[PDB]
Every structure is written in structure tokens, then in C-alpha cells.
């Protein structure tokens, strides 16, 4: 082990392409650009979504929906997150403190995702049909 006996892993330092450096290289002259037109030019090319002038897809199609401001303050909790809180009591404050939900979250739902192995008390949170069965099976309690 020396400063002149260290090598990178095979395939980890692939050499970059160097356009316009002769015939032998395979990338000489046009540099993989082909012949003439807009795309061959320096700074040449069309913008994202441009289709030649035909009404583009993101314009042919209509807009839909609205953004719900409530969805942004609503989070989901996995059963695998209940054991991660300090205290055995799962509230909005406990999940925030355990870094499970965002500081600005005002509503949360416990869902059947992962497993609950310890008895836990869930408070002031919505619980799904399946997650209620899982929490109660593990010796837990669900209160408003």
C-alpha cells in the first residue's frame, strides 16, 4: 500500500469523449453531429416539447384539477414508524419529534404498511381499517 500502488476499480473512471481529434478516434470532423441543419450548429437545437410547429402534446391536451392546500398539511404513517417514537404514545407531536412527519403537518393517517411488534397508543390520528387490526393485534390502543 503506497501512493504509487493505488488504482481505481475497473470501469469506475471511463475516459470522456473528445470530439474533433482525427479519423482514428471515430469522432473526428463533424464530432458525431452529422451533416448541416440546426442540430449541427453551436448553440443549435429546439426547445423541450417543441414538435416542429404542430400544436404540442402539452397544448393539444386540456388542463385538469386543482391543488389542495389540505393535502400539503396531511401526512401518512407506516406501522413501522410507531415503534420509532419515544414513549409508546403516537400523537402529532411525537411523530414530529421522531422526524416521521413534517413540522407543519396538522393531520396524519396510520396505514397498513410495514409491521407493528410493540403495543402502542395512537392519539388524535386517523387509522385505516387494516392498520387498526394490526395495532390492536400487537396489544395497542386507538383514541381520538
Amino acid at each position: 500500500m503506497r501512493l504509487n500502488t493505488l488504482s481505481p476499480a475497473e470501469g469506475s473512471k471511463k475516459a470522456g469523449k473528445r470530439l474533433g481529434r482525427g479519423i482514428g478516434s471515430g469522432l473526428g470532423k463533424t464530432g458525431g453531429r452529422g451533416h448541416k441543419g440546426q442540430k449541427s450548429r453551436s448553440g443549435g437545437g429546439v426547445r423541450r416539447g417543441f414538435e416542429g410547429g404542430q400544436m404540442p402534446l402539452y397544448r393539444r391536451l386540456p388542463k385538469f384539477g386543482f391543488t389542495s392546500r389540505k393535502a400539503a398539511i396531511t401526512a401518512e404513517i407506516r406501522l413501522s414508524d410507531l415503534a420509532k417514537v419515544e414513549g409508546g404514545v403516537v400523537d402529532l407531536n411525537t411523530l414530529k419529534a421522531a422526524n416521521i412527519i413534517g413540522i407543519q403537518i396538522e393531520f396524519a393517517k396510520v396505514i397498513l404498511a410495514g409491521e407493528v411488534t410493540t403495543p402502542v397508543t395512537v392519539r388524535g390520528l386517523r387509522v385505516t381499517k387494516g392498520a387498526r387490526a394490526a395495532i390492536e393485534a400487537a396489544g395497542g390502543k386507538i383514541e381520538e
Binding site: 404540442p56 402539452y58 397544448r59 391536451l61 386540456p62 385538469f64
Partner: protein, 64 residues
């Protein structure tokens, strides 16, 4: 700098569970009396973006 979303595209496409995009069908805005109820019924549910168009939508939506 950060890539900028094509804001018009963000109002028309939504990324689904497996990576594709859902959109609203064209032709259900006006000139509706002449259109058959069957035709207008099939234009009501959302549809998926086609293979040929994915590249275009994905280019417009780098943060989807």
C-alpha cells in the same frame, strides 16, 4: 441553475405509480351537442401518455 418546469405541462400531466403520466382527453370542452353520448362518455376518464410522447412530457417535467 435549477432546471425550470414547463408550467403549462405541469397543469396537464400527473406522474403515476409505475412512472407513466395521466392526462385529460381532448375534445370535451365545447361543440358538445353534435357529439355522441358514447364518444363523450369514453373521453371523460383520464388516459395514459403514449410511448412516443413520454420523452417530450418527461423533458417538460424534470421534477415530476
Amino acid at each position: 441553475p435549477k432546471i425550470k418546469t414547463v408550467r403549462g405541462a405541469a397543469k396537464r400531466f400527473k406522474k403515476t405509480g409505475k412512472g407513466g403520466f395521466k392526462h385529460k382527453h381532448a375534445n370535451l370542452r365545447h361543440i358538445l351537442t353534435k357529439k355522441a353520448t358514447k364518444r363523450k362518455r369514453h373521453l371523460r376518464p383520464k388516459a395514459m401518455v403514449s410511448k412516443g410522447d413520454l420523452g417530450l412530457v418527461i423533458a417538460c417535467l424534470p421534477y415530476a
